[PDB]
Design a protein around this ligand. Structure first.
Ligand code: ZN
Ligand code: ZN
Ligand code: ZN
Length: 178
């Protein structure tokens, strides 16, 4: 197994996957690393099994269809994995915890949003469709772009949104377009 957390790239108290060489901090893994379970298989491994069980699940899909899917166990897992892929980027730090807004010439968003809030919402099964989860994730970046206006810090929102969107298209097998 690796000697650093796959998500945050630090050592520490690590839980090792039984079916692949990745390791995790307890609350870096999503869902949080399960208490017992020997062997234990990480979310990367669980996602790969879904694909292997249904090879056709990789054929291209329309985003509008994906968004209307109910949050059954497999879609729940896919959203958890997509959330984890965003935390894997170090620039996620800016969007993880609850923001506050006091900048001359700007007003804070009407509906603040942050990664840990989305994480709690997934854990509590608050989303009934994929659309719920995707809307909250896109809101994080849209709030940031609107608040920071012409400051160059707006680019951090563009960058992390790009990681989100690329991973969304990969995990949900969205049909490739020009
Ligand atoms: Zn970690
Ligand atoms: Zn694994
Ligand atoms: Zn099949």
């Amino acid at each position: 197994n690796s000697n650093i957390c796959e998500v945050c790239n630090k050592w520490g108290r690590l839980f090792c996957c039984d079916t692949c060489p990745r390791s995790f901090h307890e609350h870096c893994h999503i869902p949080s690393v399960e208490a017992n379970k020997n062997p234990w298989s990480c979310i990367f491994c669980r996602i790969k099994t879904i694909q292997e069980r249904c090879p056709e699940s990789q054929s291209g899909h329309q985003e509008s269809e994906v968004l209307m899917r109910q949050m059954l166990p497999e879609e729940q897992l896919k959203c958890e994995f997509l959330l984890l892929k965003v935390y894997c980027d170090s620039k996620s730090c800016f969007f993880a915890s609850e923001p506050y807004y006091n900048r001359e010439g700007s007003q804070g968003p009407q509906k603040p949003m942050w990664l840990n809030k989305v994480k709690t919402s997934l854990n509590e099964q608050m989303y009934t469709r994929v659309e719920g989860f995707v809307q909250d994730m896109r809101l994080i970046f849209h709030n940031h772009k609107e608040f920071y206006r012409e400051d160059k810090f707006t680019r951090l929102g563009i960058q992390v949104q790009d990681i989100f969107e690329k991973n969304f298209r990969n995990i949900f097998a969205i049909q490739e377009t020009s």
